Design a protein around this ligand. Structure first.
Ligand code: CDL
Ligand code: ZN
Lengths: 76, 406, 122, 443
């Protein structure tokens, strides 16, 4: 992983992530894993955003359900 | 990029492979205005396409096509009748079946003719008649070629063929030996198999017979108050690369968006009328004829006359000694202009004309561009200016010139 | 809504038709629309869209003949009299000439109505 | 063989330029596009209309090559050049024979990197700009849509014409154009795409050879991000009455949706539901849209089309009617708005038909190298990426009738509308009577 990853590949990740198939997910994870080897100064802001969203994001395990409290109040 | 003809089960085929998700299927039929028995028969016969067949009504056809997500389009030209169908690649079998059913069995109900077919043809005829340039080019064709391709295409305002004439013309025109099937989807073998399977029960008739084209000349004058027009027409035999290179040499438009150009016609207009009358040249190749036309358009009649005179002088001087660089640039432009007409899926004059004649087609026709010499172009030009040309004038007739005063 | 008739279920069984032929003969004689020189299909109501469209798809000869027959019948009805027994509508000429066109129009309308209401049952 | 569907490669350079090429193996023509994310919206009230002036310019020779030498470069090699300016982006493209692409790319890079904007050129082009502005006015559709834009987003820079006022055109100077070029032509907001014979590696090499000097912008913003404040929809009407015209062009629109809005394809599906019509259509009677049925049955109008023009943070969603049956315009408008409002109880079959039609139409349009290049450029300039057909199919398929009903009740139900009329529009009623048809009282 030496060449910079194209911006149109790491833009609006949250909307696309659910629809995006498994193979693209593994490819992106592997590419970012190979990328983070270099010193982080040379990296762009969007790469950092994508990396953080991949690691400490909302998808995957920590995707909890949200309950509308107003609905509970009105039902009561 | 090139159609490779075959013949399966006695059916003409022309396949093409492209990396796209959408295919097509067109049936080019030799039933144009050249072969019509009376005025307006071909147009009405074309309009009857995709009407009530022997298996499904027109409403069912339209609703099924709408549900499947496809576009059904027809096209009438001076020497063909074309029925197309663009679709996603899933419904290729269904669309082939529909086209085969439409061509083979299509009952002609007189009330359908009196209800839907006739008003649509009349509306199209009025829409064509409203335009001025198309009428001028049609009159140029009428004056150039006496009959055959010199016949009017669209329905005249004072004609109304009976249903029996259309029915018998369709009976003696829709036969296996008088059309071809053209497909340009992402697969050719499957399309060929389906076309051979479904376009197989149509009877083995006989090809329609027409006389060789007869070439003459004449001038027509009409009056108008708006933009003035003046057209020159040089009839010629079947198209050759020399004619294409000559047409690209004449040019007329601009290579870049906002400029005047540097071809012969642009220089003539600039030197004559200070770019107050645009001159444009074009070529229309037919099966056994071609028409190289020059169109001079503008608002000032005097500028039109001066531009016409200067353009004719330049065309006459083009036969003396053509510099090599001019021929090189003309060939370079003509290659691109000819090749660009094959990308669109819908057929035009160039692609249909190439596909009709299997002797050359497009495989060797393009290869012959790079073997054109200034002597060949000079010979072609000198042969064109032997017989008199033909003119059509629209606008104030007191200033627009006749052919004897160019 | 529309005229109704059990004119096919009886045709299914030949015995019923053979039994009911004389009664139908007597009834048609008693109706007396043939005494005015008319045909049965002339009397059918024409005020909806279907029959109005159908009447515009007849051959011109049929329309002209129907117009003349109706006008002559009304002229006779003016003076309360009938034609002599020679100029009565013979059975051979009293055929159904409007029903097929109306059937075609109704079939077209029913096909459009069917397409109108659809559903997706996965 | 079955072949395949080529994929759109994407590569970026050090500066930030993005390259996206679709390569056809067997082809003889190629198209190259270079787009800039700066339309006429970035112009202020003083220097309005500079983008169109730049578009007309920048073809008059750079410092290295003068005019009448650039054209000879684009004629003796068999090429074409073109450019058009929208309200948010500018596009330059040039397609030629497969063996004359690198020279055209080099010429385009020379044109965009530096130009010799001279006072004499501006003085010469002033008159041609004035003539273009005068000649554009004749067309009815352009005037109707310009008036609709002006009356919808009034006050905002998005509500001005692209060409600009006459005073703006005549008073423009060299410094304004130079400043616009300096502060809006940055490598972060540029793009270069292709579709045809050329390959990805060749175009990347060409871009590195030539487009390697464009300095990035001061702020590191994204592509297609909103700039300025969100415009406010202001429902109003404009009546440019003229009794000489034998027709009556009318356009009605409501608040639209942006590129990134999470219901975009639902709005597209609704537009497909409404559909288009024309009296010259071969199968006009048999179309399966109720509005077409009524209009054709009663001969109410000549034709009508539906549009869903969208922008960075707003958009429009309406219809465009042309008619000559004067005196029955009110019935046409009433039935159009009734069919609009009915969409809150839409049935499954209509939604399925609209989905199929939209899926077919989104792919049947691309049939040439120029069209594919334009589509790729626009998708990259407005969104940031080009959606593969799999993603588009998945997004469209998820849409159901309940989503359509929700969106219609949210935006199509009783709400402010924007009207624009040109011609013999006397038969058109007031604003309140027009608006009253947007909601049905029998529910
Ligand atoms: C009960 C109250 C319901 C109000 C009725 C109504 O809104 O109109 C009928 C309305 C039908 O219109 P729609 O299809 O729902 O769409 C209404 C549009 O806004 C279309 O509206 P529009 O802008 O085209 O104008 C129509 C509206 C405009 O009329 C007015 O502005 C009323 C003017 C005053 C006249 C008298 C009141 O006319 C009416 O409301 C009908 C007035 C009746 C005239 C005289 C009555 C005589 C005896 C009946 O709904 C009904 O038929 C109501 C009953 C439903 C039963 C189920
Ligand atoms: Zn302009």
């Amino acid at each position: 992983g030496e060449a910079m990853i194209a911006r149109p590949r790491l833009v609006d990740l949250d909307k696309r992530w659910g629809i995006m198939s498994q193979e693209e997910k593994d490819g992106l994870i592997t590419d970012l894993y190979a990328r983070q080897k270099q010193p982080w100064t040379t990296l762009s802001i969007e790469e950092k955003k994508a990396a953080y969203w991949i690691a400490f994001g909302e998808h995957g395990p920590r995707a909890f359900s949200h309950i509308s409290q107003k609905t509970v109040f009105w039902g009561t | 990029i090139s159609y490779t003809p075959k013949k399966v089960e006695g059916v003409s085929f022309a396949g093409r492979e492209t990396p796209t998700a959408t295919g097509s299927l067109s049936v080019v039929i030799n039933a144009g205005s050249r072969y019509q028995p009376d005025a307006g028969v071909s147009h009405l016969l074309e309009k009857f396409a995709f009407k009530t067949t022997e298996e499904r009504s027109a409403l069912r056809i339209t609703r099924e096509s709408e549900l499947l997500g496809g576009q059904l389009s027809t096209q009438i030209t001076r020497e063909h009748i074309i029925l197309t169908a663009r679709f996603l690649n899933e419904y290729l079998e269904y669309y082939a079946r529909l086209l085969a059913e439409v061509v083979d069995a299509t009952k002609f109900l007189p009330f359908q003719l009196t209800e839907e077919v006739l008003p649509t043809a009349r509306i199209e005829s009025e829409l064509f008649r409203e335009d001025i340039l198309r009428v001028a080019m049609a009159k140029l064709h009428e004056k150039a070629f006496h009959r055959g391709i010199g016949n009017e295409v669209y329905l005249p305002a004072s004609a109304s063929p009976s249903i029996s004439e259309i029915k018998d013309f369709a009976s003696k025109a829709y036969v296996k030996s008088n059309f071809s099937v053209i497909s340009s989807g992402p697969d050719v073998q499957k399309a060929s198999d389906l076309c051979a399977k479904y376009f197989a029960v149509i009877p083995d008739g006989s090809p329609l017979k027409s006389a060789p084209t007869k070439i003459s000349s004449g001038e027509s004058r009409v009056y108008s108050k708006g933009t003035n027009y003046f057209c020159l027409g040089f009839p010629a035999p079947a198209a050759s690369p020399e004619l294409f290179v000559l047409s690209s040499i004449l040019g007329g438009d601009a290579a870049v968006k906002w400029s005047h150009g540097n071809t012969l016609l642009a220089k003539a207009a600039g030197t004559a009328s200070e770019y107050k009358a645009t001159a444009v040249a074009d070529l229309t190749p037919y099966s056994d004829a071609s028409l190289l036309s020059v169109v001079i358009s503008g608002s000032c009649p005097k500028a039109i006359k001066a531009t016409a005179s200067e353009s004719f002088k330049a065309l006459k001087s083009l036969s003396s000694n053509i510099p090599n660089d001019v021929v090189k640039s003309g060939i370079a432009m003509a290659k691109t202009k000819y090749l660009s007409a094959f990308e669109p899926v819908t057929l035009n004059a160039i692609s249909a004309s190439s596909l009709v004649s299997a002797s050359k087609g497009s495989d060797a026709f393009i290869s012959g561009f790079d073997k054109v010499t200034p002597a060949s172009i000079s010979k072609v030009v000198s042969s064109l200016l032997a017989k008199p040309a033909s003119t059509v004038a629209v606008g104030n007739l007191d200033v627009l010139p006749y052919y004897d005063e160019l | 809504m529309k005229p109704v008739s059990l004119a096919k279920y009886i045709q299914k069984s030949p015995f019923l038709t053979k039994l009911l032929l004389p009664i139908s003969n007597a009834y048609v004689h008693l109706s007396g629309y043939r005494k005015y020189g008319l045909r049965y299909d002339d009397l059918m109501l024409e005020e909806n869209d279907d029959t109005q469209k159908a009447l515009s798809r007849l051959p011109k000869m049929e329309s002209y003949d129907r117009v003349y027959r109706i006008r002559r019948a009304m002229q006779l009805s003016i003076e309360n009299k009938i034609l002599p027994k020679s100029e009565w509508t013979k059975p051979e000429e009293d055929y159904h000439y409007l029903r097929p066109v109306l059937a075609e129009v109704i079939a077209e309308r029913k096909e459009r109505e069917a397409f109108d209401a659809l559903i997706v049952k996965k | 063989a079955t072949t395949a569907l080529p994929k759109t490669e994407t590569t970026t350079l050090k500066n930030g330029l993005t390259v996206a090429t679709e390569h056809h193996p067997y082809a003889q023509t190629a198209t190259v596009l270079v787009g800039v994310d700066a339309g006429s919206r970035a112009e202020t009230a003083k220097n309005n209309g500079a983008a169109h002036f730049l578009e007309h310019l920048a073809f008059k020779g750079t410092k290295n090559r003068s005019q009448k030498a650039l054209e000879l470069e684009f004629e003796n090699t068999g090429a074409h050049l073109n450019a058009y300016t929208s309200r948010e982006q500018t596009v330059y493209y040039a397609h030629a024979f497969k063996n004359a692409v690198p020279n055209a790319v080099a010429v385009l890079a020379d044109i965009l990197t530096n130009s010799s904007i001279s006072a004499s050129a501006v003085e010469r082009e002033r008159q041609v700009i004035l003539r273009e502005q005068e000649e554009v006015d004749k067309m009815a559709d352009e005037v109707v849509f310009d008036h609709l834009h002006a009356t919808a987003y009034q006050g905002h820079p998005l509500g001005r014409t692209i060409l600009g006022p006459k005073e703006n055109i005549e008073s423009l100077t060299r410094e304004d154009l130079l400043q616009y070029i300096k502060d809006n032509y940055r490598s972060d907001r540029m793009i270069i795409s292709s579709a045809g014979s050329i390959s990805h590696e060749e175009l990347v090499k060409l871009a590195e050879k030539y487009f390697g000097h464009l300095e990035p912008s001061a702020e590191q913003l994204s592509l297609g991000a909103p700039r300025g404040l969100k415009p406010r929809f202001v429902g109003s009407e404009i009546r440019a009455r003229d009794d000489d015209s034998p027709t009556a062009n009318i356009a009605i629109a409501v608040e639209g949706m942006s590129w990134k809005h999470p219901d975009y394809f639902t709005a597209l599906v609704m537009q497909a539901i409404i559909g288009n019509w024309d009296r010259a259509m071969g199968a006009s009677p048999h179309l399966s849209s109720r509005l077409s049925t009524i209009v054709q049955q009663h001969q109410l109008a000549n034709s009508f089309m539906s549009f869903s023009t969208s922008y960075s943070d707003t958009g429009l969603w309406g219809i465009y009617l042309v008619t000559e049956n004067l005196g029955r315009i009110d019935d046409l408008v009433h039935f159009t708005l009734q069919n609009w409002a009915r969409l809150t109880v839409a049935t499954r079959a209509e939604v399925e038909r609209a989905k199929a039609q939209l899926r077919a139409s989104l792919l049947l349009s691309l049939d040439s190298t120029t069209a594919i290049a334009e589509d790729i450029g626009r998708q990259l300039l407005t969104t940031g990426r080009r959606m593969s057909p799999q993603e588009v199919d998945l997004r469209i398929g998820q849409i159901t009738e309940k989503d359509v009903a929700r969106v219609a009740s949210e935006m199509i139900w009783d709400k402010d509308i924007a009207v624009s009329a040109v011609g013999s529009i006397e038969g058109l009623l007031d604003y309140n009577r027009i608006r009253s048809s947007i909601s049905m009282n029998r529910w």
